[PDB]
Design a protein around this ligand. Sequence first.
Ligand code: PRP
Ligand code: PRP
Ligand code: ORO
Ligand code: ORO
Ligand code: MG
Ligand code: MG
Lengths: 224, 224
Amino acid sequence: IMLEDYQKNFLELAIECQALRFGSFKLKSGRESPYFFNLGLFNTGKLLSNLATAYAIAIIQSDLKFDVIFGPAYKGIPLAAIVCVKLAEIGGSKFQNIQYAFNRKEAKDHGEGGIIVGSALENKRILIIDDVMTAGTAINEAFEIISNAKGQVVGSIIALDRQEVVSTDDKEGLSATQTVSKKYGIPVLSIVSLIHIITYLEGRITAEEKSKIEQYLQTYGASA
Amino acid sequence: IMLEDYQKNFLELAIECQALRFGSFKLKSGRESPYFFNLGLFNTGKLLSNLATAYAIAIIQSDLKFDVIFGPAYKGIPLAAIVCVKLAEIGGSKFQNIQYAFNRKEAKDHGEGGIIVGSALENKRILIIDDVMTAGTAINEAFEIISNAKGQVVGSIIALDRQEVVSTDDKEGLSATQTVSKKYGIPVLSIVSLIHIITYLEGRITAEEKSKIEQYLQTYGASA
Ligand SMILES: O=P(O)(O)OC[C@H]1O[C@H](OP(=O)(O)OP(=O)(O)O)[C@H](O)[C@@H]1O
Ligand SMILES: O=P(O)(O)OC[C@H]1O[C@H](OP(=O)(O)OP(=O)(O)O)[C@H](O)[C@@H]1O
Ligand SMILES: O=C(O)c1cc(=O)[nH]c(=O)[nH]1
Ligand SMILES: O=C(O)c1cc(=O)[nH]c(=O)[nH]1
Ligand SMILES: [Mg+2]
Ligand SMILES: [Mg+2]
């Protein structure tokens, strides 16, 4: 339960800008969650740079080799851009050829056409970047988009691993990130997990929100 | 005729990544154009960083004061993010507080909800960032989004002013940028104009491409 420097830095900022919030939220999966992590609150020049640094440190740590960083609409779009920039800035010589890409929700019926903006994906190694993983639906849809574009996914990175199951009916009790990793045979990286949030906020948190967090995790929390 | 250094550098950048395409393109306005400037081709970390620098210099030298840099979907999304970062990096204390924002095409039906990602627009001074202006429809629609959110548009910046009319029926034949600027009483900044890129390319434009561009501008080119 010991946090790394860049994780402590990231979580400190997440609290400051109110990216991490407690209440009542309908997730994309339709789950009623007592907390929500909104990366859209990292919205100053400094916070965006700090956010990009957090991802870049996690990516550098993994020693993963890739050509394009792909961010799915919508949260993934600014993420792909800022992290691509950051990796070329702090990568030294390893990420000097690094490219970015993202998708439109719908194919463009004029201009250059297509759904992919940025780098062409065919025959390139792709890192998928996103904000959070819950049930893993978004990443699976991103995988298909990339597969259809003839790119090869070599990994994924998220800011927050919510440590939830794909479905409550899954027998092994593997988290979404673990399921995706095993399913595609690729590393799934994260800056922090829910466990890091709980252990970091330990020094200054109720004790009433914890009740709702534990109640939510009995339903959706991974056990493996 | 006489280019500023940041313009020279940008034009070099545009040629480096070959952002200017030739062929037969249907524009968003439905115009059939012999050329197409695709900002999606600034697709490496270095290209994105240098692209952001071009926007940032132009913004800084305009002395415009604003709170949020807003980029319309889709091309404006990475632009708002990278230029927000860049301005905080090179702009000094006058730009340590600016925030970025962008829109989804459709309202989010869950989570944080809404159409705006990043900074809330209400009660803030907004600079709209986009890639190109042709007929000006995108910037008008961005203005409407911001105005309906009770934000205050204070200016706009694009990479390329295509120097075309809003409508062939407009009486003075002012360009789209000139029309938008007068209409809203706001500056409309552009890194470069069509005439800059054509002049810069010199003999690199073919006889076929030259003739097609002439024909296009006889129809759609501004005169004021
Ligand atoms: O693991 P999952 O269950 O798929 O949920 C996680 C996804 O949900 C959100 O996207 P969403 O489309 O809701 O929001 P956005 O429009 O802000 O990207 C989030 O950005 C993740 O991509
Ligand atoms: O001045 P106008 O006549 O409005 O044309 C310029 C706009 O057209 C393109 O957007 P589009 O929605 O076609 O493409 P995108 O989805 O790649 O942003 C371009 O990115 C500008 O925003
Ligand atoms: O599952 C989601 O929809 C979701 C959860 C979360 O914590 N943050 C987010 O942006 N989306
Ligand atoms: O008008 C357009 O659709 C358009 C023109 C252009 O040169 N580049 C672009 O991205 N869109
Ligand atoms: Mg998303
Ligand atoms: Mg656009």
